[PDB]
Paper text:
Mammalian lipocalin and secretoglobin allergens are associated with a function in chemical communication that involves abundant secretion into the environment, high stability and the ability to transport small volatile compounds. Lipocalins are a highly diverse protein family and on average, its members (allergens and non-allergens) share <30% amino acid sequence identity. They all feature highly conserved β-barrel structures that enable them to transport small volatile hydrophobic compounds. Guinea pig allergen Cav p 1 isoallergens are found in hair and are expressed in the harderian gland. Furthermore, we solved the crystal structure of the major guinea pig allergen Cav p 1, a lipocalin closely related to the well-known semiochemical hamster aphrodisin, allowing us to compare the binding cavities of mammalian respiratory allergens belonging to three different lipocalin subgroups.
We could solve the crystallographic structure of Cav p 1.0101 at 3.7 Å. The crystal belongs to the P212121 space group with five molecules in the asymmetric unit. Cav p 1.0101 adopts a classic lipocalin fold: an eight stranded β-barrel (residues 9-112) with a short helix insertion between β1 and β2, followed by a 14 residue long α-helix and a short β-strand forming antiparallel interactions with β1. The crystal used to obtain the structure of Cav p 1.0101 was obtained in the presence of 1-decanol. An electron density that is observed in the central cavity of monomer E, likely indicates the presence of a 1-decanol molecule. In the four other monomers, the corresponding density is significantly weaker. This density is adjacent to the carbonyl oxygen of Ser14, one of the very few polar atoms on the surface of the cavity available for hydrogen bonding, which is likely involved in an H-bond with the hydroxyl group of 1-decanol. The Cav p 1.0101 cavity does not display any access to the solvent. The β-barrel side open to the solvent in the LCN1 structure is occupied by the sidechain of Phe74, which belongs to the short β5β6 loop in Cav p 1.0101. This loop, which is part of the interface between monomers in the crystal likely acts as a lid capable of opening for the ligands to access the central cavity. Based on our model protein Cav p 1.0101 we observed that the cavity inside the β-barrel is defined by the side chains of 17 mostly hydrophobic residues.
Author numbering: 4 to 150
């Protein structure tokens, strides 16, 4: 499931991590899977201190279909959904200070969700404790490059 992808929306119980400036407000660029997807390489940008910080990271599949990646702390995410033009993740981020920020991340080829996909995502968030308000839609706020 390789290619050039875009972050459509992000969510977090601690919204600050995905707000403009937070380390988890991640605008994706590439999601390259290996042969059996036991490792996924992610090229992505994060606006931090007014800088578009590029990162290229590997997420390895544990023996339980979960994925561990080091990025702004220890992260453990599952692929909650996977369609032809979209896919969602539910990550548990443990930053340097031990704060556990759990949340969702929709990544796809388009820049926005349909009305049906939107309500479904809102339900999934409130269901997993995250409020409807703690959902940032990164559409139109991607002022980073591909260098």
């Amino acid at each position: 499931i390789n290619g050039d992808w875009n972050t459509i929306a992000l969510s977090a119980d601690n919204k600050e991590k995905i707000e403009e400036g937070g380390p988890l407000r991640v605008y994706f660029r590439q999601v390259d899977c290996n042969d059996d997807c036991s490792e996924i390489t992610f090229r992505l940008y994060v606006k931090l201190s007014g800088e578009c910080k590029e990162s290229t990271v590997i997420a390895s599949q544990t023996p339980d279909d979960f994925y561990t990646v080091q990025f702004a702390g220890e992260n453990t995410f599952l692929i909650v959904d996977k369609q032809e033009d979209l896919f969602t993740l539910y990550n548990t981020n443990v930053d340097e200070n031990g704060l556990v920020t759990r949340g969702y991340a929709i990544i796809g080829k388009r820049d926005s969700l349909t009305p049906e996909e939107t309500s479904h995502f809102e339900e999934a968030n409130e269901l997993k404790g995250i409020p409807k308000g703690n959902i940032e839609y990164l559409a139109g706020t991607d002022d980073c490059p591909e260098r």
